[PDB]
């Protein structure tokens, strides 16, 4: 069907795949138990993204939703990806600063809410109500970011310098990249329809690769994953 955005879905497919393979090869060679746990989690992240990117490329995960007097193209496949990838990334961060079980539960719960309401909003047929779900989803995102910035950064002060320094960089990459998603959603096809789907796809691809492969390289190349 040659939709304008396929080139970005194809490029995201390739980068997510390359990233996954490389992390897989690199993780299989490691013998430290703790480093292996980080490797399995981190490898799974782009592996999942890969499948969803490839599916969308082949014409799946796309549904037309009515609102604003138009049949708007909505890629729901993105939420099936993010439902599992975002909490795994949070787990990597939590294991890094040795966060408590209660903290992890709250972050994942908040993450599930962010993705769930995000998807409900992306499927809502009442234009103005789309933004109510988006508002609720962004709020949950802000809760998560608050915890990583105020809770975790504090927690990282119990760890060695290199562990705290690695966490700060990953914390900063996450805060910057994650905060951008709601904005893209708002001005894109899911929201105000200002930015075209092809460009929107290009934007999500850059953020996704960065948030997963970029994040992954930073973490797995560090000495912080060793027990
Ligand atoms: C009209 C043009 C029809 C052909 C379009 C290009 C088809 C080949 C490229 C896309 C393919 C499927 C997606 C993944 C591509 C990975 C390419 C190598 C990355 C390394
Ligand atoms: C020692 C091994 C430590 C790592 C074990 C695997 C961690 C990643 C897989 C499990 C994760 C959490 C549960 C849900 C996994 C969903 C995976 C994608 C399903 C599609
Ligand atoms: C690999 C994917 C990552 C790191 C995805 C992060 C996605 C977000 C932080 C998404 C946030 C959203 C909102 C705040 C509100 C509207 C809908 C979402 C799900 C796009």
From Swiss-Prot:
InterPro entries: Arc/bac/fun_rhodopsins (IPR001425), Rhodopsin_retinal_BS (IPR018229)
Domain of life: Archaea
Any one Pfam family match given in the protein's UniProt record, by short name: Bac_rhodopsin
One record GO biological process: proton transmembrane transport
Keyword Transmembrane helix listed: yes
Cellular compartment(s): Cell membrane
Identification of the protein by name: Bacteriorhodopsin
């Amino acid at each position: 069907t040659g939709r304008p955005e396929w080139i970005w879905l194809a490029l995201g497919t390739a980068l997510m795949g390359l990233g996954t393979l490389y992390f897989l090869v690199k993780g299989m060679g490691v013998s430290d138990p703790d480093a292996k746990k980080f490797y399995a989690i981190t490898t799974l992240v782009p592996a999942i993204a890969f499948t969803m990117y490839l599916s969308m490329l082949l014409g799946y995960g796309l549904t037309m939703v009515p609102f604003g007097g138009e049949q708007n193209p909505i890629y729901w496949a993105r939420y099936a990806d993010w439902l599992f990838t975002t909490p795994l990334l949070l787990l990597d961060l939590a294991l890094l600063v040795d966060a408590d079980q209660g903290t992890i539960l709250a972050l994942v719960g908040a993450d599930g809410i962010m993705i769930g309401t995000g998807l409900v909003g992306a499927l809502t047929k009442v234009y103005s109500y789309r933004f109510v779900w988006w508002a609720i989803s962004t709020a949950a995102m802000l809760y998560i970011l608050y915890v990583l910035f105020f809770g975790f950064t504090s927690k990282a002060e119990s760890m060695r310098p290199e562990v705290a320094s690695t966490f700060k960089v990953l914390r900063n990459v996450t805060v910057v990249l994650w905060s951008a998603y709601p904005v893209v959603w708002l001005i894109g096809s899911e929201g105000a329809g200002i930015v075209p789907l092809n460009i929107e796809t290009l934007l999500f691809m850059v953020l996704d690769v960065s948030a997963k492969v970029g994040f992954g390289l930073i973490l797995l190349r560090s000495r912080a994953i060793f027990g």
